[PDB]
Amino acid sequence: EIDYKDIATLKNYITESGKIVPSRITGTRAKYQRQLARAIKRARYLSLLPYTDRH
Amino acid sequence: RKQVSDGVAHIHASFNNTIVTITDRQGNALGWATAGGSGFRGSRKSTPFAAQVAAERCADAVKEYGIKNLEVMVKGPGPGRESTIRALNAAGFRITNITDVTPIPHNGCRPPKKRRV
């Protein structure tokens, strides 16, 4: 729900390009989606998940 | 002077022109061609064929370096981003990778607006 110390659970809600997948696809709905987005955006700034993608 | 088998191409196609540069993965360019430099003007300077002849002019490069294995990094929206690869991959080279590397603002600072006629 908020922590960066596991990415194996966060991988399901992202793409190969590290983009966040919309809640209409993953059954998360907007409320829990907005929590997973915080765990991902923290893991991004700690360089634990890809932020930008070019290739 | 020595055959090294491997290279990487950088292609850009716009609504006015097309650019094709041949490099090594060490960033080093070895030759280049353009659709304008092919002798083309106006609404014709961007065309798939003006770019096809630029690729045939570029496919004469690197013969002494013995390059055959090719990666392609593509840019721009222009129709030239396809005919250039097709012709180069027929001119002795073999493709292994094609990837789009168009640099994009994501997203700022104010939207573009130009030419109203």
Binding site: - | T47, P48, F49, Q52, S83
Partner: protein, 150 residues
């Protein structure tokens, strides 16, 4: 926009063995003068008699293999802009175009007489140069300056 038609089928000549003579006498024909057409039909093969090759029965129809049509240009307007496209010649009309290109110099050159104009132009047949070749050569420019059409 709704009248629909076809083409008239024609038979090979009983003497000349070819379908060329069944149509070519209606080409360069004017004022209904079909006996003048039957009086100039291949009459250049006498001005070319030293350059005719074997069998005068085919010695004019062999020239169509060097008239060699490949493309025809169509020009039409879409919106304000007129465009031009070189399209490949159709499986029967390719022969009709060769039959039209072979008479381009028959009057519109300074040589005097149809037969002499035509024999001089049938001797420029391989390279196609100078006068009376515009409609044969300049149509090909458009198909070598562009090979990406739809």
């Amino acid at each position: 926009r709704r009248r629909v038609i076809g083409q008239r089928k024609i038979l090979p000549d009983p003497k000349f063995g070819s379908e060329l003579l069944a149509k070519f006498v209606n080409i360069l024909m004017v004022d209904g003068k079909k006996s003048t057409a039957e009086s100039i039909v291949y009459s250049a093969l006498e001005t070319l008699a030293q350059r005719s090759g074997k069998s005068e029965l085919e010695a004019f129809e062999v020239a169509l293999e060097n008239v060699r049509p490949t493309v025809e240009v169509k020009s039409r307007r879409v919106g304000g802009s007129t465009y031009q496209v070189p399209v490949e010649v159709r499986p029967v009309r390719r022969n009709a175009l060769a039959m039209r290109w072979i008479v381009e110099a028959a009057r519109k050159r300074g040589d005097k007489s149809m037969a002499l104009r035509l024999a001089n132009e049938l001797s420029d047949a391989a390279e196609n140069k100078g006068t009376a070749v515009k409609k044969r050569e300049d149509v090909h420019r458009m198909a070598e300056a562009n090979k990406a059409f739809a």
